[PDB]
Amino acid sequence: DLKFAPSFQSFVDSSFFHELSRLKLDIFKLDSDEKALYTQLDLNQFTSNVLAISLRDDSFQKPDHNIILKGYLLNFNTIELFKNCNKIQFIKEKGQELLQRGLENDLNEIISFYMISFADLKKYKFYYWICMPSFQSDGATYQIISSKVIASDSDISVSFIKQNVIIACVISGVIQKATPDNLKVCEKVVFKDFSHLKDIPSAVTKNILTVWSKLSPRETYTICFLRSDESSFEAEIIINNGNNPSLKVSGWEKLAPKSIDLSSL
Structure with a gap:
């Protein structure tokens, strides 16, 4: 069989959550923030052999040359919404969308990363979870x-x-x-x-x-x-067995959220 390495290893500099904080603060988006992420793909220097999705504070601005990967962030407003977020239904849908885009536009479009998060600007702790949807036919x-x-x-x-x-x-x-x-x-x-x-x-x-x-x-x-x-x-x-009517999506970075409690001086 053919095995696949996790498509990426996240690298969220505190400057990303600092920026997320800033952005989530630019306007009191009491709802869940759905931002587009941009990270210049360093196809030269990887991290632990997988593409390094390095999300710094700049990961929110679309760049100018080099390869820029467009991702998406879904920052939940509450820890419970983040915890209750049906992660499987979520990646499944993101997966069906990439499928559509690939068979109707360009294969480059089937590649993307999505991040769900909860920026607890109170207890100053940032819970997040990144995934790069990897879909396939069920049982494939x-x-x-x-x-x-x-x-x-x-x-x-x-x-x-x-x-x-x-x-x-x-x-x-x-x-x-x-x-x-x-x-x-x-x-x-x-x-x-x-x-x-x-x-x-x-x-x-x-x-x-x-x-x-x-x-x-x-x-x-x-x-x-x-x-x-x-x-x-x-x-x-x-x-x-690629003919099953169902799509099996995975891609969630390992399976639990990452929480960086930048409050340990």
Whole structure:
């Protein structure tokens, strides 16, 4: 079977909750804050081998070049709402949305991160939980039928790296947008993997597979996993039992909220 590394490891500098605090304070949003997060994906220097989602105070401003990942924050107003938030129903829905977006627009859209949190600006404790939805057909499994190392130096590799996209496809040897019609005829999909783990792509690869699957039903699916790590590899994948009508979503960072009680001088 094909295993997937958690798609990311969160790194929320106190400056993020400081900023969240500030932002949650700009206007007394007594309701739950649903902000868009932005983090310049450092596809060079990872943390513990998985993409590092580094949320600082800047993670709230859309940047200018480099690859910027758009995420979403859902800051609950009460600890109970945060605790009671049906986390499974939540990631399931976020999962179905990425599915839709991937099979109707571009595969790059199937990748995102969502954070739920509770900023206790009183007892000065910040409870949060980040997830990067990883969906697939219920009961679905994946085997890598084939894989080969990829030269980051390749004219075609450089062609992908020269691009601001993290996911693309190849059509007649030339890198093309991972669009539906392109996906229906492309030889493969190129992905700037969120994992530097040897041959273990980020759990987010399921998204690509799941979407590409429904768009272009095929015996197999080939995906190039590029890494600045030297670990870049291309893989041919087969989906097992990918036909169930249900979507199985995961992605929640490990399974419990993280609470940073910045009140320990």
